[PDB]
């Protein structure tokens, strides 16, 4: 299925692309961010 993309704001339907993960922040909004080492 289509995904959002790292460094981008998650969406209601949709999870982050394969490799990036959705993570909420203190500001209240959540954005995707590529995995880290």
From Swiss-Prot:
What is this protein's name?
Answer: Lambda-hexatoxin-Hv1c
Q: Which GO terms describe its molecular function?
A: potassium channel regulator activity; toxin activity
Q: Which Pfam families match?
A: Toxin_16
Q: Quick one: effect of changing residue 2 to A?
A: 7-fold decrease in toxicity to flies
Q: What is known of its domains?
A: The presence of a 'disulfide through disulfide knot' structurally defines this protein as a knottin.
Additional detail: Negative results: does not affect a wide range of potassium, calcium and sodium voltage-gated channels.
Q: Could you tell me which species this protein originates from? A: Hadronyche versuta (Blue mountains funnel-web spider)
Tell me where in or outside the cell this protein is found: Secreted
